[PDB]
Design a protein around this ligand. Sequence first.
Ligand SMILES: Cc1ncc(C[n+]2csc(CCOP(=O)(O)OP(=O)(O)O)c2C)c(N)n1
Ligand SMILES: Cc1ncc(C[n+]2csc(CCOP(=O)(O)OP(=O)(O)O)c2C)c(N)n1
Ligand SMILES: O=C(O)c1cc(O)c2ccccc2c1O
Ligand SMILES: O=C(O)c1cc(O)c2ccccc2c1O
Ligand SMILES: O=C(O)c1cc(O)c2ccccc2c1O
Ligand SMILES: [Mg+2]
Ligand SMILES: [Mg+2]
Lengths: 536, 527, 532
Amino acid sequence: PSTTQARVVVDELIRGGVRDVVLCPGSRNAPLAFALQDADRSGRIRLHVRIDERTAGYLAIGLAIGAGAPVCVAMTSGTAVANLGPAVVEANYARVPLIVLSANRPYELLGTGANQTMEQLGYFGTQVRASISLGLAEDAPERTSALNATWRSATCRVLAAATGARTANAGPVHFDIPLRTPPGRPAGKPWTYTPPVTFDQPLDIDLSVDTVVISGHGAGVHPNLAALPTVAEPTAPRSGDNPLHPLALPLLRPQQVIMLGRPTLHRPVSVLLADAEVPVFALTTGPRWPDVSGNSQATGTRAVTTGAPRPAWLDRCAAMNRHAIAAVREQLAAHPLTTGLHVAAAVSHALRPGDQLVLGASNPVRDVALAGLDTRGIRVRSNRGVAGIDGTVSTAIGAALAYEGAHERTDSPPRTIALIGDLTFVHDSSGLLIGPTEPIPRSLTIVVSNDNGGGIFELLEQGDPRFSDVSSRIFGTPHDVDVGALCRAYHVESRQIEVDELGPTLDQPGAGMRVLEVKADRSSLRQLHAAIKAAL
Amino acid sequence: MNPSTTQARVVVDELIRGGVRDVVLCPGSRNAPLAFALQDADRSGRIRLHVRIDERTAGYLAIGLAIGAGAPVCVAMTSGTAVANLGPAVVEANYARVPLIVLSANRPYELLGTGANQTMEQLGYFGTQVRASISLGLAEDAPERTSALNATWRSATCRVLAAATGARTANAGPVHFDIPLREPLVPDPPLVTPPGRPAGKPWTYTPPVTFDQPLDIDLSVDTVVISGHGAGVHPNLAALPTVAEPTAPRSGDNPLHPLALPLLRPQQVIMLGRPTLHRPVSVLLADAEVPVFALTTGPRWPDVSGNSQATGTRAVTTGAPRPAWLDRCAAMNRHAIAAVREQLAAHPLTTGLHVAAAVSHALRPGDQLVLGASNPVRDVALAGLDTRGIRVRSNRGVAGIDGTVSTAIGAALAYEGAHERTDSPPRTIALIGDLTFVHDSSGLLIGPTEPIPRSLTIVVSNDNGGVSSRIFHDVDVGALCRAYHVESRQIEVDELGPTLDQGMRVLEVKADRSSLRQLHAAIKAAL
Amino acid sequence: PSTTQARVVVDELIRGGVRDVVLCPGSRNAPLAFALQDADRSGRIRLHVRIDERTAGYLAIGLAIGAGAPVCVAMTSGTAVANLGPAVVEANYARVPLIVLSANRPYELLGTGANQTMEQLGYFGTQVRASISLGLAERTSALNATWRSATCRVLAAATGARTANAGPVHFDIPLRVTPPGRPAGKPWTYTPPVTFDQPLDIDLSVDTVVISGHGAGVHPNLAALPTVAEPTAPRSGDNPLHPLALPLLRPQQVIMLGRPTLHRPVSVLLADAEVPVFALTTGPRWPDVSGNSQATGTRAVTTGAPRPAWLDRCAAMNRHAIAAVREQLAAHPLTTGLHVAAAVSHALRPGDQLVLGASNPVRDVALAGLDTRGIRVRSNRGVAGIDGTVSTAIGAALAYEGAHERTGPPRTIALIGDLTFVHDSSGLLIGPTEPIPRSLTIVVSNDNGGGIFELLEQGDPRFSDVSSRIFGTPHDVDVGALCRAYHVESRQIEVDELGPTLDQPGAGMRVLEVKADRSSLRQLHAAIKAAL
Ligand SMILES: Cc1ncc(C[n+]2csc(CCOP(=O)(O)OP(=O)(O)O)c2C)c(N)n1
Ligand SMILES: Cc1ncc(C[n+]2csc(CCOP(=O)(O)OP(=O)(O)O)c2C)c(N)n1
Ligand SMILES: O=C(O)c1cc(O)c2ccccc2c1O
Ligand SMILES: O=C(O)c1cc(O)c2ccccc2c1O
Ligand SMILES: O=C(O)c1cc(O)c2ccccc2c1O
Ligand SMILES: [Mg+2]
Ligand SMILES: [Mg+2]
């Protein structure tokens, strides 16, 4: 009955490329729970069990962005929708193939004097690419074949919407399997096959006009833009090797901007993208496109270029790039205290091709860009879809698990190194709790630049000295957490170290999961950035 | 100029730059800034304004102006139930992939919850039916912010346009564009609108996109093509026998009658678009014995009742159909349509099928045909209409009866406008059942100030009919036509063809429902 | 088993007071269709079938406000949700107990590449008081209890039985000798009279005016006060204040009853920060204009009494406003909607049901000074649409006549504009199988366009060149031929004889058309103000 339907869906889901599913024990039995257990023992799919439904959703995001696979999470309780909300919104904005699995009871009253099987909020209506319900399995062995095809093709429709197999717009899907082995295609092929879909929108750009590339989250690779000065966010794949340090951009006067993906960092980027005297061309990989103050002049997916940049423009930007990273390095050297920017510069020098970098929001993701990281050869992950400081520990854990599993399918597994701030760490500290029955990454290291509060607020307008009396409680928000004791409580190896130890410590493989705490200072963060501006 | 006027003129100016050539408008006080702006563009000849009274049928008018020429069409109305009345047209525009922009005026959102007159939860009313629901935001009284506001208003408008036309998604559909407006709502007694791009370019240019998904298919396997609503043109599929719905564009010269399909044994079928029509088409699709390849123009693809091997946008073909297979389908096609034409002539009295055959015999290349989504689209398909060189429209999105008359009027008007931008205008002939005509009879209503189609003939085949089924009317079609001042002459099926050679008129042809069961059974037995 | 379930649910709806259910032919069978057919055959319930789903929704509105009973309408097609939307919005805002019946299918695909059983829009989540689904059908005595309690739940939410906020409810009954209910016809779960009490201390010595709007309650302790009552407000006293007199007075505080929506002077005062406004409503919601309402309640505990001079000043402006309207209507040659409204107002006798369309009609009746005492006045003031007014009158006539018939046939007179009439013209077609009112007269004041815009800013003569096409919207519809096409009795008369025509009974349904002028509306109203 349901059991055959259950095994059919899981089989099709595996054929569709799902390799990881995330579960939490709930009052109701999970949708497909027994079928997933069977598949997990046989080695066809990998289960991850958590108690915290919120960190479990972010765990599923990590398992998806770690290697690009669609990931399932099976809701189990009345609080699951509420707890999965944040990760679903992130999956929508960051275009992450996340399949949320539900199980409705159609023989039960709905909307009356009882808690509902699925406590429904409003976000499913606005966040998901599809909400598909399979419909009740029926006792009909005469029609066994007809239901097999109906179940499997619908599962392919779920996967198609999840991975953007026809829309070029991956994102979350709500897959419902209500509650009261037929074979798939031969050679393991999916039931309904959707080929690679190319979505193409050419755009004429004249490269002789002084041009800068600004690539952000979700940017595509563009070989014909490789030589242009490029301000690339850390999660943006780089097409060339002519980088433009973000602090150098406000000291230049570009006449034309090619904008790749969705930029979210640096105030001078916002100022330039909003400049009515500067044409801005949005090149994206999906149907969506962003704008700053309504200044995007055209949208497309690839450039058709004529002309070539004037060598004086390239030399002027190249000299501005060298000037910018020099001021950063020089005044970090002349700065007596350790700041998060110091920490980010140390992590940047320690990484090597093949690593995976997972960056928290707030200062870490900006600090790494300011330090001049060369992301070539490195996979950079960061939840830029909504830029939350929640769920980052489990994002790194899932991203490391997925990435290490992909390396396995082909030497020791590649390094996954994470740089997050202290609030970010305390937010998702329950992500460290992993039972001995669950998969744990072999080469994950989490670097926590701990300046005992939110350092990025020392740089905004509320960090101005005229607010010094009142800004500590409501923007600084110190906590005095014993990071080492918290890691001890969760049985994860942890050490507090100084900046010079980071490179050596990271090079020496430790336990599968380790937390490297570096005590940083934000008292002097504003003065440090003011000095970096003054050196420019 | 006050904010509401400035904002409404900027919005209408950008919509014209986006290709809007026709706007349907419904009266109201809250939408006065749009109406004022729209009439000026009408008087300057940038658009054609169409005023209607009934929002619901006005939406299907807008649909017709969209499918007749292929352009985005706005419908603008006041706040409250005026917006709810666009519901039915939005559902049809959703499934039919029609670029219908619902341009609603609204009270300031700050009044929602105060009990203000005619103030409801507008934003989001249409839910998932629309491609997007976009609120422009209340216009600030800020003269120094004007240029900035111009950039954001225009950019929002092009987002509305892009979602509605599928400029980047390849999935055209309806879009809700809500505009909160505040007093003053009429232009001030100040005698320049913030400018858009030079040379009439759109604020955010987005070139039409290419969405490609190639599919390996082997034509040596005995194949039949089934092409439904929204199907595309496939030259490498032109030689194969094709069962094509009336609104599906023909790719070749090898037709297959729908009655002939269930008497043949195809080994694979290529499905084009979304087959909505034939009952035998669906019975063969719901068969795991025969593989199905779905070729669509956009991201959507139909539930095949299972057993769809693959979906794509185009075929890459190896091999060629068996000559024997071609001869067999071609024989059965002749046999099926010969059985229809012979039983028709043998039937003593004129039926709905006879009227449909007479219409098809009278069409000629260049004509536009609008069919009611019930029996007319089936009857014409049974008569074997060669839709090549003909534009065939029908609201096959949900196949409702709402707005069928207005859709025909909208399609004629938009079709004629396209011809006008290049001798005498082409003909648009509509075939509507009486119950459908009775239902949307108020869709005939065109105020004396508004455009009437130049060459539109609505053919009503009246058979006085098709626990709720107990209502199945004897409603005078002529009297209805006088009530909305439309010339109507009742005729017979033999005068139809000659008559159609002769502005907007209705030709009622009295038909019989008594003998179709006998007629249809006679066709089944002749196969 | 679903047959038993439907019979149980239909039976519980009868016991819950449902007397009328509206149906539409659609792609699949309606929910409860057979059990509803048996109830209609046996006379326990009255079915009304229409083709137009939108007019069928408003028919249910009429059948609900005509006598206060909960009314069901059963969706049967894909476009049903979309076509029912306008009525459901009105039912939410006007607090009308509308039960929308759905029959979802749990054994079928949902959300896939196919047309859906229900094409869902976004409004159900914003408008309805509840969404209850029964769940698919040896345990028959327990299932009977679950089904009947759930059905009472639906009824309670729709009638505001525990919330005091009646409104629309979505009731889903899934599908792939009948168990009795409580004895003596009692409902399964009894919810007794609920009283939501919220007293407000108001000093009546302060110069006070009362403004009452839609849904206003009756306050015997406010009878003596001057009252600017909207037509659909039940009057508690005998001291009216004409709305045009309001700007000639200086009230010091205002008691606002229900939800007012008419007259700019009412809005201007309700927003005056120097005027305390107390909102007395019958339900949990309360209105505000510009956030000026100082307090809310359900009733007033009063201290003091109005000043004798205040009563006299209000009464004098009241007479002056009545004199201004009556006199200027006499010195105006052409006939307008305001003349037609006055003639209707004088033809009404106690026991009548007056149904007023939006636009000028419901305003003109207020300006004509109609005493609503003894009259049952209906108007779709929830959203003030001009849609669905014909079927609203028809359903209200049917429910009102059915109330009287069960007592041992009062008149329903409708006054609507021409645009309003053309909007819901499809409501005139009723099959011979379907209930038809016996004493419904629809007066159509036809000035070939929307006369209300002649009275607004867009009616200023500076827009005379452009106003007619986009605000007037003339249509030249032959109203006579329209009613003829639907086999509806209709005559076209002058206003001189509309009075007498309404005095002599006619066919069960009849349309009286009075040709009107709107090119002189702005001058007429300007003269009324100049005569004030
Ligand atoms: C879920 C969530 N809550 C609150 C915020 C607001 N916020 C943005 S950055 C930030 C400071 C983060 O502190 P930390 O992790 O210590 O980073 P650093 O101090 O290194 O900047 C906060 C609270 C957010 N982005 N996401
Ligand atoms: C469904 C709907 N659409 C549009 C409007 C806007 N509107 C308000 S009054 C009016 C004119 C009504 O015309 P008519 O029925 O002739 O009344 P008159 O003012 O001429 O008496 C319009 C179009 C509305 N209230 N409801
Ligand atoms: O390019 C992307 O990946 C991307 C992702 C998004 O979530 C967006 C949301 C709004 C607007 C533009 C977006 C966008 O361009
Ligand atoms: O190809 C099309 O045009 C088309 C359009 C649609 O609205 C569909 C809706 C559901 C399922 C398939 C669909 C489809 O194939
Ligand atoms: O009293 C009523 O009948 C009533 C009805 C409504 O629909 C309201 C909506 C918003 C705010 C107040 C409201 C109100 O006071
Ligand atoms: Mg910090
Ligand atoms: Mg009028």
